[PDB]
Each structure stands twice: as structure tokens, then as C-alpha cells.
């Protein structure tokens, strides 16, 4: 049937339309797959979801006809995420065998023959789906490339199975949560690169598993977890990220619904990151896409780590606040896992008082239809009917995986390490407008300090998130800063909800407001617009990356272009200033190290670092991972606090800025300096996540303290109601230089933390 | 009630157009250097593929956005990847597009590829495409193929503005010898006679006529600098976004592929990068260095006028 | 015949346009490669015949009475003048390049041509007495692509798509004094395939595309190419004029195309080429946004990717390549005629 467009026949649907073509090849439905696992806490942890590893469960084959159930994973001893390959005769999923080798992505035909192991990893993996890249049709394709200045030739051919992504996570991390995982997605190849060598001409650069003829790539970098893959109708993957970022969203954080490239070229909001959207702190897990009427219902779970809750959905074309549903609605229990199919049916994994079975879904009566099937010991969930899967249309990919490029000329893959000599990928991105955005004035940092215009916003400062990793579990402590602006989000390294981070550069911003710069790749990263003193107005709080030889384009700051609005066509100075070489990659100037700045400490340029290293014009700076610069309270300020300012502050004088850097104990914990639990004081009747005192966090512009050292009101949201004392005043403008100044600046600016180098290090810290 | 679909009427003979099958590899569209051998039947499929927007990835556009649905052109001016950013393209006027490789607008001149510049074949250009404008997926080689046979089955309409009598005007032919004069010399680079039916006004070959746009340290600079002259004085804003083209623009290449002057009364915005924005600027040298694009100094208005009419009836 | 711009043949009609009667009895197809007409009974749905005409035809007219057909024939660059009850061509009237569209005077009195050329601009206009060219009423700028006459009947409108411009414009024309009183400029717009009026005549609307010429080509997502828009306009002196999207977020409306006005306003029909499907809209909660709203609101509201579905009334499946839609008088159904499926999708409307 048409679904998204006219077909060539009268009920007939054509083969561009996703939704209508898989309702055309879906046929009967006769046998089902799906999770059983035991019902316990160990066995069904649905609390420490994104983390899920079900001890004990098992992968089941139930037929709706003859009522008999065969376990097919019988060799493991924990297996879940059962997902169907396009024909319907084999699947993959995540468990871990009773071998050992910890929890990795296997694959087996239906009938429980032909088991294979798609990764071996350190760390877990979770939730395989498959996309087909370069294999539409059965059988084998050609690889085709050029000589190295000869012809195109072919040499060889592949076996065309697709590609797999997945979500998993390394081992020893911590998120922004301080849970023990950070999970993402890779991209897997089925032939051990030679899928990517026929899209491409290059084998896949990532970690390879030559024993399992397999090769991995990371296309997702943020810092908090990505999970639950699933199919676009327009050929992009599904997903859900959690986006923690420092304090946002009122220190608590938000589970989006998203989609990106199978690359990860091109990461967009699809729902529920953006203020004035629907469900708050809900988790939203488990999401798919109804063929009929097109609308990605999810999993709503009242708790943002929980996979179990109730089911809500949102218009796939439209994904909006007007569109958004809550399908299930009402009494008495919970759902997980719904699974819609191409009729318009749904089975979803529904408990009406305590355990899961397999349901159909009722949508006359919004809640569970007739029974499937119910084992009473076990708890039944994540249903996967056996049909025909239409296959989505593959995008082309950019990149052949780490440090691989691919050039849009000759479309030919290249190493920019190590070939080209560059210490790092690198990629490019480029805003049209830094002035535009749908963000009113406010105290929060992801508002606007201060009104800006054309001119106004001078440069950028582009930050560099660095992963929390405590090898030393004497060294670290979570909740150290919990009396400071941080709380339960605080730890040893930082006293607020801001984790260590360092700059990747400044990069100076045109007339128009447009800029363009080249920067690391593969890295978590964000950015700051910045005034004529070099301040933060406004924070853009997520994870950004760039893929190797990858451009990044967005029309202004949070405008809606890459979220509910078209590109706004902007003529843009930055535009002549990305690519203008024959011989070049990217002709766009790199990240600047520090900046410059006049008498009275305004902006005055940018200024190169001394990590300047011919496929550019430009001098290559910033590529040099311990190379990069970061700001240290211990390193950096505290020795500024104790020769200028400690002198006449001190318990009499608040704040108290003396002691040095000997750590304090509150409530038992020794983490900071005096100094740094003074300036971190929160103050009654202003929100944490503003800021306390004299420091907001993100804001330095908004900040007491940068308010006083520059004498002078700095934005439009006042700290606090009496600002400066009437009788007794001292201007401290003079007390400090523009170096010092402009430290506790990007201090600030930075989230403020306490330690922002990784791991344990020779500064005093936490230690028992 | 709601809206829905009780009936067809089939006027004519029952149509569907070609199977998804199986997508071409961006290596093995760049495999296909020459042109296929000519397909008649495929034509109408390629029509369809030209005029199709599902098949790309969310139903935004199709080709028949740019290059009209005539096959001729929008005449809108695009910035293009592969060629570099700040460089703008005049979308091609595709009417007899086969009669003249190779193809694009860049020439042989910096391009060793034979892919972006000096394109080899048509296969290149649309099999692209997908992955290069649209970012959508591949084609199939059938329906490439297909769009192809299109592509070279496109014929010229002829000028409008010639006599009934088939005959051309005085002021026409007061302007072709203009045209043919050895000392302006159009002649060279765009050989041709307007009663005959196969000239295609074109040597097909790379040539610097001075159009190339440059940065204001010269070439590899940046940013660009304005050569529209009259707009320069005009006080026009180079970076204004209301204007119907470009008047600033980084290339990579002096030197270009030269067009067929036939048709050219229906191309919007002539050169490359729609820099002539009249058939009169291609001629008065503001948007080229002086005397690089024919010698037209010694010439006054009416001369240039009677030009302006003969290339109009080309 | 032959395919559009070629010399190769081909047996499909392959219909560019459709018309019908103001009886609403008779639906008059133009077959663009078969050079020539199809007549078809509303009631029966079959063809009662076969008009031969010039060649390639992209468009007709009707005269208010019914026994005439006004076809535009567009590479012959002329207007065939048909009888509609002998089902015979009775004359050929030659105009300007390109007639795209023709339009009868609600007297009859007189036919309107647009000459859509390149570098033509011309409307040319028919005494239906003479059966001949009178005059030409040349407009603001290039190729215009189709014309509307007002209920009034005393003004003309011509929707100008000029190529190698972004900014493409309207022209209103006064009837009786026969030239141009105004040009209203559309702005950032490309390929305008029509323009049709309100009952009341207080609007006309206009779709189109809207491509971001000045922006690095790089990805699909949000329209950073092309997005798709329907313009109303406000006839009024000094009116609003409203570019609103066709668009979803992730679903797109290709290319639209023809359009037709319900005989009371309360629907719009828009044949959308690219993704073989009829847009129908709401008019009165359009018109209702259009009022309610300012200039600088309905300017930011062009962008909104989540504003349709407030004024979208549906989506409807057709054949491949409708170019075209029609009206019965009643308003109750709606035809699109398919160029590539070589037929006509019928549609119940709303309407009871
Ligand atoms: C080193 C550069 C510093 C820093 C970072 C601060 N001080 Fe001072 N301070 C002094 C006096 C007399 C006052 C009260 C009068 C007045 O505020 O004008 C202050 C006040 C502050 C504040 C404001 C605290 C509040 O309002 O709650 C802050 C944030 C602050 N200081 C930080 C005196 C001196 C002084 C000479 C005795 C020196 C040297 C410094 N201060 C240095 C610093
Ligand atoms: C060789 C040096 C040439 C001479 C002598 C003439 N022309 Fe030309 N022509 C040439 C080139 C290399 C180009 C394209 C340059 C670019 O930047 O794209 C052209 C283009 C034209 C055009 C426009 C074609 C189009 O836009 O598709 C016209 C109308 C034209 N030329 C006319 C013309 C006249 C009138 C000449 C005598 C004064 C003449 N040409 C000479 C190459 C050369
Ligand atoms: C001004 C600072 C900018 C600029 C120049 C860009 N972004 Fe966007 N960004 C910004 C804000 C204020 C936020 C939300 C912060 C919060 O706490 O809610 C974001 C967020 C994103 C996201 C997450 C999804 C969403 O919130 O819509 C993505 C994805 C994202 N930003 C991407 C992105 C891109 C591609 C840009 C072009 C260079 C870009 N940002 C620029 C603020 C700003
Ligand atoms: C098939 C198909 C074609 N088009 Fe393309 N087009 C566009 C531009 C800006 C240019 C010029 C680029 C340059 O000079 O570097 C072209 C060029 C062509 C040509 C060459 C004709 C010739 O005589 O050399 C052909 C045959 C062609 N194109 C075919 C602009 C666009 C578009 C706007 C972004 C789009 C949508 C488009 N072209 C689409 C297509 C085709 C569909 C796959
Ligand atoms: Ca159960
Ligand atoms: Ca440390
Ligand atoms: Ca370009
Ligand atoms: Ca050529
Ligand atoms: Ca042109
Ligand atoms: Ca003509
Ligand atoms: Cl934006
Ligand atoms: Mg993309
Ligand atoms: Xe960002
Ligand atoms: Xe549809
Ligand atoms: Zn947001």
C-alpha cells in the first residue's frame, strides 16, 4: 500500500517508499523471538538501564500456531537483544557465552544452527541491528579502485551481508553520572573490512577482530550513553542519547530521542532534549517506527535509568509537541519493548501486576490486547516476529573509520596520520550566524548573558570534554562537593556538576557573526560564543563530534536548524574562508591557542600556541592531545589567590581565599582548598545550577567574582541584589593583570573545576 | 468526510518505471569513463528519474529543480563540495548536452581527474549525484543508464526571435559580422553558421577568457574580490543576500570548459558562475578582464546591440 | 509521438494538464507526447474520444458555455481553436513562445495566453469572435508561466518564473486598461507552476519552491537545499504576502504543482509532481493564520517545519507525475491527471 507517496499502480506502493514496501513484503507472521529472563533484580536489571545484562536470560522461539517454544541459546550463559536479518532466517543479538569472553555480539540462524561471534572486546556490547550498506540485493559484489595516476580497476569481490551497529561500552569509565559505563556506537563490518573496501576502496579503520574476521568503528563519541539503535524509513539510525552536560537541564539532564548518519556524520534531535518539550527527566528507551501511520513510539520510564514504563509517541515526519501521544495510558502496569509491525498490528511485553509476556497491543482500547504468550517464572520481553524486512537505503560514507578520510574529488581514502604526517584526525565546522538563536536572555548557561548583535560576539572558545577515568579508587570520591553548587553530581575533581574538560582553542568570529574552524575529530567537544572581553554570553551544552575530513554546518546557535526549522540562507563571510585551495583539504585556520587582548583587557586577536606543526594552507595547531591546555584550580589559580588575594582575606574578610592549598574537611570529606569551598558557596534563594555566590558555573560573565574584578555590571542578570557596598568599597580592577584576570575567566568559563587533570596526579587531592 | 481515493481512469497505456535493484559504489560510477552505447527504449525511465523526488532521502527536490523539467535550466546558482566553497556554479543548461564534451564547466586545466573539471562522461556528472547534491541513495546502473539516454536525447529548441520566414533580421545579421569579424574574433573559440542545423558554436575545448574569480592577494587568496565593475560602483553589497548572483567568488581554476551558444537566449545568467547576469555583460567587459573575452573596446553600443540580437538568434 | 525536448518516440499520452467543464459533465486532458486531447464523461469515467491537435499541447480552457476548447500548444507556439461537440480542431491561432496556460474571460468574450519563453514576456489576448490574436500585454518580467482571471473579472494576474533570478514575481493587470497597475515580488522563490484565486477574489495563491542559494550544499536535512511553499497573497492594495511551507520535518512535498480553489474557499488542492501525491489544505485555517498574523510572524512561520499539520487537512496517494488538478463544480471530487502513469487519480473530497 502507499504510505509516503503514490505508488505505480492503484495500491500499490513504490519501491523509494520505505513504509509501504515493507507492508508489501512484511507476509504472515507465524513465529515469534524473545527474551526470557529470570525475575530478580541480578536477572532482570531494568534499573541500570542503558546497562542491561540480564544474567541468566535466555533467547526463545515461540510459534503462535503449534504453541511450541524452543530455546536456541542454550550454549550461553546470558543472551538478550534478539534482532531479525532482512530474510528473516537468521539473527543477531548480545550475550555472553558459558565460555567466557564477557558480553559480546553474536549471530545465529533461526533454527539455532550456524553461531558466530561478531566482536571480541574489552568492555560490554549491547543491542546489534543490521543496515545494509552497499547490499540491497542477495549475492556478491564488486570491489572497484583507483591505481595509485592510473584508471579505476577491479580487484576482487565480496560477499554482500551489511554492516551491524551497535552500542557498547570500554571498561574502567565512568559517565557523567559517575555510573561504570559510557556507552556508544559502532559500526561493524561482517566481512572484515571488505564491505567498507567496496563502498569505499578502503578496508575499515577501527579495532580489528581478524579471528572473527570482523572490524569495528566508533561513530558516536559522546561522553554519556547512546543506545538502542534502530531504522530511519529515510535509511539514517534511530537512537537514544543521554545528554548530561555539566548542569543543563536543571542539573539533572535529559534522554533524547535522535537519529544520526551510520557513520555518524550527522547527529540531529529528533524529540525531548529541548526546553518546553514533553516528559521532563523521563528515560526514553527502546524506540521504534509505525509503517502506517508513521509515528516512533517509545518507552517512557518515569525514572531516566529504568527500561520499563509506559509507551508514548511522537509523528516521524513531525516530531513535535502537537503530534505527541501517550499511547499507553492508564492501568494498571508497565510496558517494555513494543514492537510494531508493517499490518499496523504491535506486540509489546506488558505486566499487569508484576511479570512481563508477550501482548498484542490494542490501540481501540489503549492498552494490551489478547495474549500471546506467558511463562509465570519468567519474565517475557523484547518480542522479535519473523517476516521480511524491507531494506532501508544506504547514505554514502565520507570516511573508511579512524584517522580515514575520503576526498570529494576523486573520492579516493586517505590516512591523515599516518600518511599525511597530522598528529590527529581532523575535521572542519562552521555557524553562519553565532547571534541567532531561539534562546531568550537569562541567568541559565545555556541562555544568553546579554543581548548580541552582528559585531558583537568577537570570537569563540571551542572546549574539549576529557572521559572520567579513576584507575585508584583511594584518589577519587563521588559527592565530595555535595554542600557546594555540584551535589550529588559532584565529586573530588570538581565541586560542581561540570566534569574535567580543557580547550581545544579560540577561533575569532566574522563581522556577520558567521565563523569556520578546524578541529580535532573523533573527540566529545563544544563550544562558547564570546564577547569583546572574551566572556562566555552563551553555552552550547551537548557533545559534539566530527568524523576524520568532515564539515559540520549550522545556521545559527540552537536556531532550530538542526532541530524544528529550515536552514535560514545566509550569506556568510566564513563561507570564503573554509575551502578556497586546489591542494588543500580545508583551507579553514585552526584553533588558536590563547587570545590578546588591548590595555583594559579587550579583545584584541588571536594568538598562536607553541604546538604549530601541505594538504592546508594553514599553520596546524592544537592536534597534540598533551599538548592541550586546560585550567587547573591548584595549578593555576590558587597560587594567583595566594600571592594577590589570600593577603587581606581571611575568616574576617569573606570570602576566605587563605590556607593555600591545604584541603578542608566537611562532613568528613577532605577534598578542596579553602579557597575553592569559599568561591564555590551556593547562596540562598538562587538555583545551583546558576551558580553560587561569587561563581557561576559555565557563566563567567554572570560570576560575583569576575563582576567585582572588573568593577563593573557585565550582564543582564544580577548575581545577587546589592552588588557593591555602599560605604567601605575598594575597586579590585587593579589587583590583578589581564593574564591572572582572564585565567579565573576561562576558569569559570570552563565549569570550574577543582581537578581537570584525568586520573590521579601529584596535586593535592582526595586521598585515604 | 476524509479524503480518499474511490478511482483511477486509464486514458492511455499502462506505465512503471525501472526496480531499485541493486545501487552503484561510488567507485564504480567513477569505473564508467565513456558513455554507453546509445538506448531509445531507456528514455522515458530517465525522464522519470530526472523528474522523480522520492528516490531521494526525504522528498525534498529532484534534478527537474535545477535543470527545469524542459531539460533546460533554473538558471539558479549553486555552491557545490567538490569544487571548493566560495566557488558558485551556474546550473547547466543541458538542451544537446552530448554533442559537446567534455562536460561540467571547468576544463582540462587543474583537473587530472576527469571527474569534477573536464568530465568524461555524463555518468559521472548525474551518478554523482546521489552522493554529492541529493545525499541520498545510489543509483542502479540500469537507471543511471537510463537517465543518461535522457540526458543525450535532449535537442536544441531553436531561437524564437528569427523570422517566420525562417530568414534572419537585419539587425541580426548586422550583428553577425560583427561576430564574425577576424579582429573581434568569436569565430575562434565558437565556430559556427546560424542557418546550420548541426553548429554548436564551441571548439570544446579550455580556454582563459579572464572569468576566473580570484582573491584580492590573486589567486589560492582569500576572500574573493568583486568583478562585477558596474556593480562595484554601483555600491552593491558583495556579501548581500538579495541578489540574483554572485558578484565575489573564490575559484580553483582560471580555465573553462567553453558552451555552446546555441539556446543561449534561454540561459539565465550566463559564464560559470552566473557572473553575466545579460547576454550584454558577456560582451562590455565588467564581469571579465578587458579584451580577455573576445575584443569588444573598439566597439560602441550599437555594434554591441546588434551582437547582443545575433546572439539571440542562436 | 514524441517525447518532450526529443526526437524519440513514444506511444503514451503522457497528460500535462486537466480541465473541466463548467457544466462539470466533461474533463478535457491535454496529452502532452500525443499531441493531442482526451475527452472524458465525469460520469462514466471512459473516453468518449480523441482530439488531435498542434504539437505537445500543456494546456486548455473552456468557455463558459461549454461548446469550445481552448488548447495551448506549446512547441508549435500556438492555440488551438476546438469544437467540443464535433470533436474537431476548427482553427489554429498562433501566439508568443511557449503558451504554458489560457484562460476565458468570465464573459467569454476573451481568451488570455501566458507565454512562458524564456526570454519571452507576453500575454496574448483572443477575441473569441475573431477567433484571433487582438494584442499583447507585455509583463514586468520573463516567462510567465500561467495566468488567473478574478471573479471581478476585471483584473488579471500572472505569476512571472524567471530564470537566473531568486527573487520571481506577480503581475496584476487591469482588464479594461490592459497593462500593468502592480508587481508583487516573491522573495527566495523558484519555479511558481501556479496561481489561482479565492472565490471572494481577496487572495490568490501561488506554489513554489524556496532553494537556499547562497548556502554550502551539504546535507537534505531541514530543506537546506530546497523547501517546498504555497504563497497567499492579499489582493488588497498593499497586502500581506505570506510564504508558508508544504513541508514535515522528515516528509516533503516535491515540486508542487497544479492547484485548484474549492468553489466556496474552504479547501486547497495542490498536485505535488515530485512525490506523486495531492496536498489538500485547510483555506480557512490558512487564511485565518494569514489574517491573524503579521508580516514579520508569517515571515518567521515560512521556516517552521512543524506548521502544516496545524492547516494540512491530507495527504493523498496518486499516480506518477500529477501535474495537474481540477475541480467539479460541486466541489466534491478532485481529479489529477498523471503524466507518467499515463491517467487520471479521482478523488471524494471533504466536501458532503
Ligand atoms: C585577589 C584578586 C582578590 C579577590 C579575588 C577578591 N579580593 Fe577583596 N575585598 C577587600 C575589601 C575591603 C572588600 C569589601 C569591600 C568591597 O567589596 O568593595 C572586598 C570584597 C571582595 C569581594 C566581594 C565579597 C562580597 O561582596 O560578598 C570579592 C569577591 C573579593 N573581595 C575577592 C579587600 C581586598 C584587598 C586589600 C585588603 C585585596 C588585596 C583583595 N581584597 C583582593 C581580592
Ligand atoms: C576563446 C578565448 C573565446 C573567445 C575568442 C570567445 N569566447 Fe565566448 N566563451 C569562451 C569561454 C572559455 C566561455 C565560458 C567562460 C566561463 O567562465 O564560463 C565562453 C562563454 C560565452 C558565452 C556564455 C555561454 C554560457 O554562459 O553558457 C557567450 C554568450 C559567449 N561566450 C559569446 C562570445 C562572444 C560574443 C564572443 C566574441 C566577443 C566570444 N564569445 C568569444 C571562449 C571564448
Ligand atoms: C551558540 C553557543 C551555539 C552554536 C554556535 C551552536 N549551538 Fe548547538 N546548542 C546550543 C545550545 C544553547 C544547545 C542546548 C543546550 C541545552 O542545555 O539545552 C545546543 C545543543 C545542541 C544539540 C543537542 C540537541 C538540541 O539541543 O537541539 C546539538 C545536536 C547541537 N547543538 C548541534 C550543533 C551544530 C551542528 C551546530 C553548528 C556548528 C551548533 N550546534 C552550533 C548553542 C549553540
Ligand atoms: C542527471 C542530473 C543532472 N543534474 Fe546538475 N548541475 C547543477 C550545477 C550547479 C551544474 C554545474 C556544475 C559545474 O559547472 O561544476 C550542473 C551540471 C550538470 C550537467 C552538465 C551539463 C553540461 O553541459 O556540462 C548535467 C548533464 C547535469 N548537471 C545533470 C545543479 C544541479 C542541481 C541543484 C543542486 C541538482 C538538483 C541537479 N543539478 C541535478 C541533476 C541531475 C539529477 C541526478
Ligand atoms: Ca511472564
Ligand atoms: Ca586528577
Ligand atoms: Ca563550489
Ligand atoms: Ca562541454
Ligand atoms: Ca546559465
Ligand atoms: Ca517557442
Ligand atoms: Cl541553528
Ligand atoms: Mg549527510
Ligand atoms: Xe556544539
Ligand atoms: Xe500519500
Ligand atoms: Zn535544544
Redesign the pocket.
Same mark, same amino acid.
Given at each position: 500500500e502507499p504510505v509516503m507517496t503514490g505508488g505505480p499502480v492503484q495500491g500499490k506502493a513504490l519501491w523509494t517508499d520505505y513504509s509501504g514496501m515493507s507492508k508489501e513484503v512484511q507476509g504472515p507472521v507465524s513465529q515469534i523471538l524473545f527474551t526470557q529472563s529470570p525475575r530478580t533484580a541480578k536477572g532482570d536489571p531494568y534499573q541500570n538501564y542503558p546497562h542491561y545484562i540480564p544474567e541468566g536470560s535466555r533467547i526463545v522461539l515461540f510459534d503462535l500456531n503449534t504453541k511450541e517454544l524452543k530455546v536456541l541459546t542454550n550454549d550461553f550463559a546470558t543472551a538478550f537483544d534478539p534482532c531479525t536479518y532482512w530474510d528473516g532466517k537468521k539473527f543477531a543479538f548480545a550475550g555472553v557465552h558459558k565460555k567466557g569472553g564477557g558480553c559480546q555480539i553474536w549471530e545465529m540462524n533461526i533454527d539455532g544452527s550456524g553461531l558466530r561471534q561478531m566482536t571480541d572486546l574489552k568492555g560490554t556490547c549491547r543491542s546489534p541491528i543490521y543496515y545494509a550498506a552497499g547490499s540491497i540485493e542477495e549475492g556478491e559484489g564488486r570491489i572497484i579502485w583507483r591505481d595509485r595516476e592510473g584508471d579505476w580497476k577491479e580487484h576482487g569481490m565480496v560477499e554482500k551481508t551489511g554492516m551491524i551497529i551497535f552500542s557498547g561500552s570500554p571498561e574502567g569509565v565512568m559517565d557523567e553520572f559517575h555510573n561504570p559505563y559510557a556507552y556508544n556506537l559502532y559500526r561493524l563490518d561482517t566481512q572484515g573490512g571488505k564491505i567498507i573496501q567496496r563502498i569505499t576502496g578502503h578496508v575499515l579503520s577501527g579495532i580489528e577482530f581478524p579471528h572473527l574476521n570482523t572490524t569495528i568503528d566508533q561513530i558516536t563519541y559522546n561522553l554519556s550513553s547512546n543506545f538502542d539503535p534502530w531504522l530511519t524509513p529515510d535509511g539514517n539510525i534511530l537512537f537514544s542519547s543521554v545528554?548530561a552536560?555539566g548542569s543543563?537541564?536543571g542539573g539533572e539532564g535529559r534522554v533524547?530521542i $535522535?537519529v544520526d548518519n551510520w557513520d555518524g556524520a550527522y547527529?540531529?534531535?529528533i524529540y525531548g532534549? $529541548?526546553?518546553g518539550e514533553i516528559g521532563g527527566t523521563s528515560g526514553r528507551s527502546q524506540a521504534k517506527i509505525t509503517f502506517g501511520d508513521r509515528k516512533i513510539v517509545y518507552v517512557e520510564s518515569p525514572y531516566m535509568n529504568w527500561g520499563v514504563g509506559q509507551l508514548a509517541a511522537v509523528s516521524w515526519d513531525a516530531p513535535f509537541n502537537k503530534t505527541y501521544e501517550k499511547l499507553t495510558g492508564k492501568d494498571g502496569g508497565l510496558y517494555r519493548s513494543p514492537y510494531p509491525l508493517p499490518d499496523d498490528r504491535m506486540l509489546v511485553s506488558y505486566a499487569e501486576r508484576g511479570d512481563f509476556g508477550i501482548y498484542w497491543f490494542n490501540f481501540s482500547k489503549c492498552a494490551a490486547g489478547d495474549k500471546v504468550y506467558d511463562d509465570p517464572n519468567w519474565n517475557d520481553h523484547q518480542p522479535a516476529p519473523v517476516y521480511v524486512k524491507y531494506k532501508p537505503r544506504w547514505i554514502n560514507t565520507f570516511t573508511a573509520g579512524k584517522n580515514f578520510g575520503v576526498t570529494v574529488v576523486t573520492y579516493q581514502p586517505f590516512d591523515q596520520v599516518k600518511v599525511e604526517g597530522y598528529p590527529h584526525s581532523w575535521g572542519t565546522?562552521? $555557524?553562519f550566524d553565532?547571534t541567532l538563536?531561539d534562546?531568550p536572555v537569562g541567568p541559565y548557561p545555556?541562555?544568553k548573558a546579554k543581548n548580541v548583535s552582528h559585531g558583537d560576539i568577537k570570537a569563540?572558545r571551542i572546549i574539549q570534554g576529557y572521559q572520567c577515568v579513576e584507575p585508584d579508587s583511594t584518589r577519587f570520591r563521588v559527592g565530595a562537593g555535595a554542600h557546594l553548587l555540584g551535589g550529588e553530581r559532584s565529586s573530588s575533581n570538581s565541586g560542581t556538576a561540570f566534569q574535567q574538560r580543557g580547550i581545544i582553542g579560540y577561533q575569532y568570529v566574522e563581522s556577520d557573526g558567521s565563523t569556520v574552524t578546524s578541529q580535532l575529530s573523533d573527540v566529545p567537544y563544544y563550544?562558547?560564543?564570546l564577547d569583546d572581553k572574551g566572556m562566555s554570553v552563551?553555552?552550547?551544552?551537548?557533545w559534539?563530534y566530527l568524523r576524520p575530513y568532515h564539515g559540520?554546518? $549550522?545556521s545559527?546557535?540552537?536556531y532550530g536548524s538542526?532541530?524544528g526549522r529550515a536552514f535560514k540562507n545566509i550569506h556568510a563571510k566564513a563561507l570564503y574562508n573554509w575551502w578556497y585551495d586546489d591542494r588543500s583539504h580545508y583551507d579553514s585556520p585552526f584553533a588558536f591557542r590563547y587570545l590578546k587582548f588591548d590595555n583594559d583587557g579587550n579583545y584584541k586577536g588571536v594568538k598562536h600556541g607553541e604546538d604549530v606543526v601541505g594538504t592546508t594552507s594553514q599553520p596546524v595547531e592544537g592536534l597534540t592531545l598533551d599538548k592541550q591546555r586546560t585550567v587547573d584550580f591548584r595549578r593555576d589559580i590558587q597560587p594567583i589567590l595566594d600571592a594577590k588575594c589570600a593577603m587581606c582575606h581571611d575568616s574576617n574578610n569573606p570570602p576566605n581565599l587563605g590556607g593555600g592549598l591545604e584541603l578542608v574537611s566537611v562532613d568528613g570529606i577532605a577534598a578542596y582548598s579553602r579557597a575553592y569551598n569559599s568561591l564555590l558557596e551556593p547562596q540562598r534563594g538562587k538555583d545551583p545550577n546558576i551558580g553560587g555566590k561569587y561563581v557561576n558555573p559555565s557563566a563567567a560573565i554572570n560570576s560575583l567574582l569576575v563582576w567585582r574584578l572588573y568593577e563593573a555590571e557585565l550582564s543582564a542578570n544580577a548575581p545577587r541584589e546589592k552588588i557593591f557596598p555602599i560605604e567601605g568599597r575598594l575597586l579590585h580592577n587593579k589587583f590583578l593583570t589581564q593574564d591572572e584576570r582572564y585565567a579565573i575567566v576561562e576558569w569559570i568559563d570552563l565549569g570550574a573545576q577543582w581537578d581537570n587533570i584525568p586520573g590521579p596526579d601529584f596535586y593535592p587531592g582526595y586521598l585515604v | 468526510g476524509q479524503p480518499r481515493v474511490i478511482s483511477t481512469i486509464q486514458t492511455g497505456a499502462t506505465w512503471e518505471p525501472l526496480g531499485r535493484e541493486e545501487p552503484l559504489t561510488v567507485p564504480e560510477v567513477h569505473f564508467r569513463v565513456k558513455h554507453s552505447p546509445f538506448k531509445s527504449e531507456l528514455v522515458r525511465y530517465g525522464q522519470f528519474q530526472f523528474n522523480d523526488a522520492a528516490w531521494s532521502l526525504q522528498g525534498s527536490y529532484s534534478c527537474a529543480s535545477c535543470h527545469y523539467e524542459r531539460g533546460q535550466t533554473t538558471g539558479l546558482i549553486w555552491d557545490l563540495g567538490d569544487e571548493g566553497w566560495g566557488s558558485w556554479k551556474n546550473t547547466k543548461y543541458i538542451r544537446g548536452g552530448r554533442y559537446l564534451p567534455p562536460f561540467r564547466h571547468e576544463g582540462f586545466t587543474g583537473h587530472p581527474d576527469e571527474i569534477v573539471g573536464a568530465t568524461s562522461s555524463l555518468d559521472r556528472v548525474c551518478g554523482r549525484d546521489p552522493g554529492f547534491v541529493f545525499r541520498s541513495e545510489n543509483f542502479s546502473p540500469m537507471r543511471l543508464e537510463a537517465l543518461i539516454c535522457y540526458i543525450r536525447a535532449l535537442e536544441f529548441t531553436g531561437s524564437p526571435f528569427r523570422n517566420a520566414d525562417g530568414s534572419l533580421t537585419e539587425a541580426q545579421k548586422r550583428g553577425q559580422k560583427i561576430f564574425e569579424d577576424p579582429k573581434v574574433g568569436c569565430l575562434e573559440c565558437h565556430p559556427g553558421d546560424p542557418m546550420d542545423p548541426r553548429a554548436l558554436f564551441s571548439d570544446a575545448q579550455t580556454h582563459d577568457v579572464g572569468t576566473g574569480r580570484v582573491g584580492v592577494n590573486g589567486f589560492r587568496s582569500t576572500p574573493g574580490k568583486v568583478f562585477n565593475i558596474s556593480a562595484l560602483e554601483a555600491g552593491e553589497d558583495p556579501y548581500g543576500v538579495e541578489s540574483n548572483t554572485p558578484i565575489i567568488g573564490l575559484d580553483l581554476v582560471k580555465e573553462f570548459d567553453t558552451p555552446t551558444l546555441r539556446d543561449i537566449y534561454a540561459s539565465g545568467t550566463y559564464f560559470h558562475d552566473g557572473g553575466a547576469r545579460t547576454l550584454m555583460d558577456t560582451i562590455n567587459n565588467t564581469v571579465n578582464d578587458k579584451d580577455m573575452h573576445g575584443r569588444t573596446s573598439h566597439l560602441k553600443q550599437q555594434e554591441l546591440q546588434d551582437l547582443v540580437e545575433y546572439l539571440k538568434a542562436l | 509521438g514524441y517525447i518532450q525536448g526529443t526526437h524519440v518516440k513514444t506511444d503514451l499520452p503522457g497528460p500535462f494538464h486537466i480541465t473541466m467543464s463548467p457544466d462539470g459533465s466533461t474533463l478535457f486532458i491535454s496529452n502532452q507526447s500525443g499531441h493531442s486531447v482526451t475527452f472524458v464523461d465525469a460520469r462514466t469515467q471512459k473516453v468518449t474520444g480523441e482530439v488531435a491537435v498542434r504539437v505537445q499541447p500543456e494546456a486548455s480552457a473552456v468557455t463558459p458555455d461549454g461548446a469550445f476548447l481552448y488548447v495551448c500548444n506549446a512547441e508549435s507556439d500556438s492555440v488551438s481553436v476546438v469544437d467540443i461537440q464535433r470533436k474537431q480542431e476548427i482553427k489554429e491561432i498562433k501566439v508568443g513562445d511557449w503558451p504554458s496556460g489560457i484562460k476565458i474571460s468570465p464573459d467569454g468574450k476573451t481568451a488570455y495566453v501566458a507565454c512562458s519563453g524564456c526570454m519571452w514576456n507576453a500575454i496574448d489576448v483572443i477575441d473569441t469572435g475573431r477567433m484571433e490574436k487582438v494584442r499583447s500585454i507585455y509583463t514586468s518580467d520573463y516567462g510567465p508561466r500561467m495566468v488567473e482571471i478574478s471573479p471581478d473579472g476585471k483584473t488579471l494576474v500572472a505569476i512571472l518564473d524567471t530564470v537566473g533570478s531568486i527573487n520571481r514575481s506577480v503581475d496584476f493587470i487591469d482588464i479594461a486598461s490592459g497593462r500593468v497597475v502592480e508587481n508583487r515580488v516573491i522573495h527566495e522563490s523558484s519555479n511558481l507552476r501556479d496561481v489561482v484565486y479565492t472565490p471572494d477574489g481577496k487572495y490568490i495563491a501561488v506554489t513554489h519552491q524556496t532553494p537556499k542559494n547562497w548556502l554550502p550544499v551539504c546535507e537534505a536535512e531541514n530543506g537546506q537545499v530546497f523547501t517546498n511553499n504555497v504563497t497567499i497573497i492579499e489582493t488588497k492594495a498593499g497586502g500581506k504576502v505570506a510564504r508558508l511551507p508544504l513541508d514535515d520535518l522528515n516528509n516533503y512535498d516535491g515540486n508542487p504543482y497544479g492547484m485548484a480553489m474549492d468553489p466556496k474557499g474552504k479547501y486547497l488542492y495542490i498536485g505535488v509532481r515530485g512525490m506523486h501525491r495531492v496536498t489538500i489544505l485547510d483555506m480557512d485555517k490558512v487564511l485565518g493564520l494569514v489574517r491573524s498574523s503579521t508580516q514579520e510572524e508569517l515571515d518567521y512561520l515560512r521556516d517552521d517545519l512543524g506548521l502544516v499539520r496545524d492547516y494540512l487537512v491530507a495527504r493523498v496517494p496518486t499516480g506518477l507525475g500529477p501535474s495537474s488538478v481540477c475541480l467539479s463544480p460541486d466541489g466534491k471530487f478532485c481529479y489529477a491527471a498523471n503524466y507518467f502513469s499515463n491517467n487520471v487519480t479521482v478523488i471524494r473530497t471533504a466536501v458532503d
Open positions: 545528554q552536560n543543563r537541564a533524547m $535522535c547527529p540531529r534531535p532534549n $529541548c526546553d565546522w562552521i $555557524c553565532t538563536s534562546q545555556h541562555q569563540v563550544m562558547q560564543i552563551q553555552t552550547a551544552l551537548t559534539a559540520r554546518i $549550522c545559527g546557535c540552537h538542526y532541530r | - | -
